[PDB]
Design a protein around this nucleic acid. Structure first.
Ligand code: ZN
Lengths: 155, 82, 206, 164, 118, 24, 60
RNA sequence: CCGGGCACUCUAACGGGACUGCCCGCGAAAGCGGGAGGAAGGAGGGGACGACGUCUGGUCAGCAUGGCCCUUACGGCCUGGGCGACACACGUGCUACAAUGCCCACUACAAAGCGAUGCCACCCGGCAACGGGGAGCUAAUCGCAAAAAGGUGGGCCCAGUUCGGAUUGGGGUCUGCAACCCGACCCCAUGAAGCCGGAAUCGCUAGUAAUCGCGGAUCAGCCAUGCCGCGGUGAAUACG
RNA sequence: AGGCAAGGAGGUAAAAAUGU
RNA sequence: CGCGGGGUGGAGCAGCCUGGUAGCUCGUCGGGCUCAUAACCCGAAGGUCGUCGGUUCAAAUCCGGCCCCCGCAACCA
């Protein structure tokens, strides 16, 4: 953490397509190291997506991710005893990760029944431009824009 | 929870104390340290001073308290009030 | 507070065990006890002869007792008498065939436990502790050691506050396994308390 | 501090208490809302978890503001100490008196201490002479709750304003 | 329906519904169904009145349940309490009994938390 | 689950066997 | 390790549910090893000495 | 399974292999950035190992001892009790609050241990803990033992519930002389709080958090949910 | 366009009492 | 005797006043922080509003008695 820029792990991409993003999403979904459960979940979600909005869910997923991707957000730095929501950029990979996380959160905030289903719905919402994850992203952006005042307190 | 296979355990002190005082009719406080033992039908009606680590404490003894060891009725630790 | 025993760290390699005999779950326990007893007894006896390696084997329940010492004469007796007595005692204690293959330690200032014992003895006579330690170190160096160390802790010569007089020579490479260091220890059973006499002799690598 | 304003109510049928305190009954939510809109002042639910959802029909924001103002006013009222010594400089004494007067005018208590060392001879007497004199000077502003009581190493008084 | 002393449940897998008897848990119910001859995959809303009644009869005649059961447990306690037994004493106190260390976590016998100054 | 000595998983956790989890 | 509580080395129990092993070098009660009959300190000491044959510093 | 075979796994002894050695780049030099072949690349990973000394750290209750003190007593024996007491408080855990779960039913994959009055195959009696009979091994060669999460199917449907299992009643199983204080376990019933937890605060940088089971040691039996130890699945993120 | 330097900015460097 | 005003968790203070809606600080308990205490932060507990009573759909609130506290007018003191 101190010395080097700390390398970002390259994964085996998806075995069903050839997508690292997909793999990452699956991992995020996966709690407890139950991948061959969350992988199954992911594919169920994909199938559901296909059933509804009849595009290859991979592309849909990508679109959703793009929609949630934030570009400026807020960190927290204390200055003169006051704590500031410091509005700075989000780095590409990091931003992507954040988006993924948000999607997962939304899936588990949703009141609908089953694992795949919720995720699928969330993805569809993201694609549309609505839902929970997208809303969160928007809020984050606003927090940057409500507090664009402090910008100059860059890291 | 009751815990004896086959051979309901009673100690041959106040096994072969109280059974002789079946012949002596009743008896007049039987002081024991063997709390281990159960309360067999032979004991019924007598008065047993079981050991409280310090006290030889009396129990007048009934037909209800048959399925129990003696040290139940001699509560060894004392008070909880502060 | 740190610092583990140097022998008990180099005991699959440079120096082999001070006992060598297999026994199963059924008999390691008794045999071990017997060995311990033997060791105790020898110590009690051959403190005069100056004892080092108190080696033992059960080679098919033929106890092999090897005492590497400072005086074969003293163990043996004045021709071959006390050696026998000791053996008999061992037999009595430990009823199995028992030998007592005495070896002298030529260069008695390479055997570190011997050195430690010597120092302890000197202390018991109440000498200048630090001086004595220094002398010991010098002797060790002379012998042909590639480095020496003597740590003596306790009530130095009859002191009311705990000290740890401490001296060394050359290399005492206490970390390398390849080092091979004779570590000796002697309990200075003294008049005001108990003194620790730790001695490290670096004889040679590989 | 903070209640459900007009449309923040899904609490079905409401206890229609105006800003006046008058009961219009157990109206719908919607009806009540309409009434509020017409009357200009919000149906604020001061007891949603009650025998009818206590629909107090005042402007919520306005009410909040009022409360805030009241709170602010409450702050501005407090205890002000004037610690004399046994030995007094007269100018200093006068200044202290003036300060006390000012405090009383403002609305603020004046706890009037002395500082005693040991030397407790005519120390208490001196304190009495001081504090009582001070009181005499500004009776119009404050009258004494606590007389010149001995604190061992102080002599405490409390001059409390005449009217509130 | 009221399959014990006023023991009505509703809308669930038969066994589970039965489990709502004060006299019955997940095992007894399963056994009972097997005995009486009603299929486990059925409901309280989907049970036929002959098959409802068999169960009602069997169950009632087979075990001691509900209010009776409550009385029995109370009776047992009394038997333990009235006689100067350890367990009885513990019960009287409000203490745990069977083999708990009480020093810290006796709470579901002690209720909530009654803090004291030190 | 885990703790409940009248399930399968509970039994496994507790170490034992019985009605719910047989030997065979 | 009272030299009076070497009533364990007194082979007699009264009941063979009283035989409580003990170390057999210091006569400690609390950390014997069936495989050595030694307390976890004495054993350690002997291991370091090299006087329990074959007992290395562990490593894997 | 057997013959048959050492091929492969293995197992275990021994050797080799990685050295910044090769190329490019910078750098006076070290060295550093990138290749390359290579199973591994720059200390490959993880251990074991902890300097002079500090903390008058801890232990005279493991032992060793100086001094003091006790001595029909502060010693010895035993029986019983106490260490487990409980209005409270903290520490470390375990289990949970559910549906990526829970319950059952079949089905599959480990490592590492350990076993002689020890493990117990298998057969029968039992709902079951287990009990009876009984082979095998003296251990890679027999056994503990099924690993579980997983995968297939069924069920449950968002509730304080098939979540959860405390507690409490009952009946039992075992060890041991003896489970009252104070055992474990089985079975049946009971079905508590708890709807992811305030201020705080801890752990962790890769086969690791997280979760899942298995072995062990002490040990009759265990209050082990601990400790040590092994494998299964297995991430995240590190701008600074 | 980059190389620094000298200057001028302005931002940030919050707070937080004690002791056998 | 008069008149005035007051009475709220342990202490000081808001509310009455506008009929529905009990805060604020100091302390008490518990926790956290810290090496430790203070301070700090977090919770928790704690008020039926002197009272009799009335109101009124409902009062701390409106009304009175009585109890008081407060100042002054007041004789023996
Ligand atoms: Zn020992």
């Amino acid at each position: 953490a101190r010395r080097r820029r700390a390398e970002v792990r390259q994964l085996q991409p998806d075995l069903v397509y050839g997508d690292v993003l997909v793999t990452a999403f699956i991992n995020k979904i996966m709690r407890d190291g139950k991948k061959n459960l969350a992988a199954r979940i992911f594919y169920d979600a994909c199938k559901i997506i296909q059933e509804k909005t009849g595009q290859e869910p991979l592309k849909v997923f990508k679109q959703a991710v793009e929609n949630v991707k934030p570009r400026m957000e807020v960190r927290s730095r204390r200055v003169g005893g006051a704590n500031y929501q410091v509005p700075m950029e989000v780095s590409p990979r990091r931003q992507q990760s954040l988006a993924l996380r948000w999607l997962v959160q939304a899936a588990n905030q949703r009141p609908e029944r089953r694992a795949a289903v919720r995720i699928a719905h969330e993805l569809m919402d993201a694609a549309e431009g609505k839902g929970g994850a997208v809303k969160k992203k928007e809020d984050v952006e606003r927090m940057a824009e409500a507090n664009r005042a402090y910008a100059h307190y860059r890291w | 929870p009751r815990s004896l296979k086959k051979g309901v355990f009673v100690d041959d002190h106040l096994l072969e104390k109280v059974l002789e005082l079946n012949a002596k009719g009743e008896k007049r406080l039987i002081k024991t340290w063997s709390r281990r033992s159960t309360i067999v039908p032979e004991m019924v009606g007598h008065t047993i001073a079981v050991y409280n680590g310090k006290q030889h404490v009396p129990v007048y003894i009934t037909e209800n308290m048959v399925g129990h060891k003696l040290g139940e009725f001699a509560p060894t630790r004392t008070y909880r009030g502060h | 507070g740190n610092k583990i025993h140097p022998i008990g760290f180099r005991l699959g390699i440079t120096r082999d065990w001070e006992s060598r005999w297999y026994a199963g779950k059924k008999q390691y326990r008794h045999l071990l006890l017997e060995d311990q007893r033997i060791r105790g007894l020898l110590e009690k006896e051959l403190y005069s002869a100056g004892l080092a390696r108190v080696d033992i084997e059960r080679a098919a329940d033929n106890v092999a007792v090897t005492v590497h010492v400072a005086k074969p004469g003293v163990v043996i007796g004045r021709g071959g008498e006390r050696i026998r007595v000791l053996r008999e005692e061992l037999a009595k204690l430990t009823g199995k065939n028992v030998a007592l293959n005495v070896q002298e330690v030529q260069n008695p200032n390479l055997s570190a436990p011997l050195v430690a014992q010597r120092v302890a003895e000197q202390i018991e006579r109440r000498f200048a502790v630090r001086r004595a330690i220094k002398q010991a170190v010098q002797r060790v160096m002379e012998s042909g050691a590639k480095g020496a160390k003597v740590i003596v802790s306790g009530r130095i010569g009859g002191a009311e506050q705990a000290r740890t007089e401490w001296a060394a020579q050359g290399r005492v490479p206490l970390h390398t396994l390849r080092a091979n260091i004779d570590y000796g220890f002697a309990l200075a059973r003294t008049t005001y308390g108990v003194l620790g006499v730790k001695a490290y002799i670096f004889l040679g690598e590989v | 501090k903070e209640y459900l304003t007009n449309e923040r109510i899904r609490a079905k049928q409401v206890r229609v208490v105006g800003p006046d305190g008058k009961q219009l009954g157990i109206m719908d939510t919607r009806e009540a809302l309409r009434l509020a809109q017409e009357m200009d002042l919000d149906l604020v639910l001061v007891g949603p978890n009650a025998d009818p959802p206590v629909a107090r029909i005042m402007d919520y924001s306005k009410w909040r503001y009022e409360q805030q103002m009241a709170e602010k006013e409450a702050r501005k009222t407090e205890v002000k100490s004037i610690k004399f010594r046994v030995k007094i400089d007269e100018h200093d004494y006068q200044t202290k008196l003036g300060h006390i007067k000012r405090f009383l005018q403002e609305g603020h208590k004046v706890k009037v201490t002395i500082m005693f060392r040991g030397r407790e001879v005519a120390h208490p007497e001196l304190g009495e002479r001081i504090l009582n004199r001070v009181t005499e000077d500004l009776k119009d502003l404050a009258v004494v709750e606590m007389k010149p009581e001995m604190l061992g190493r102080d002599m405490n008084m409390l001059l409390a304003p005449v009217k509130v | 329906a009221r399959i014990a002393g006023v023991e009505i449940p509703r809308n669930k897998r038969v066994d589970v519904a039965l489990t709502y008897i004060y006299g019955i848990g997940k095992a007894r119910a399963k056994e009972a169904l097997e005995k009486t001859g009603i299929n486990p995959a059925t409901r309280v809303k989907d049970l036929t009145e002959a098959e409802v009644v068999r169960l009602r009869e069997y169950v009632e005649n087979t075990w001691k349940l509900e209010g009776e059961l409550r009385a029995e447990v109370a009776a047992n306690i009394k038997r333990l309490m009235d006689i100067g037994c350890y367990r009885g004493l513990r019960h009287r106190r409000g203490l745990p009994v069977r083999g708990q260390r009480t020093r810290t976590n006796a709470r579901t016998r002690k209720g909530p938390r009654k803090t004291v100054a030190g | 689950g885990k703790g409940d000595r009248r399930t399968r998983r509970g039994k496994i956790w507790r170490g034992t066997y019985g009605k719910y989890r047989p030997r065979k | 390790a009272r030299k009076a509580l070497i009533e364990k080395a007194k082979r007699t129990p009264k009941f063979k549910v009283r035989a409580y092993t003990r170390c057999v070098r210091c006569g400690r009660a609390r950390s014997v090893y069936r495989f050595f009959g030694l307390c976890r300190i004495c054993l350690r000491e002997l291991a370091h000495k090299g006087q329990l044959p074959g007992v290395r510093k562990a490593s894997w």
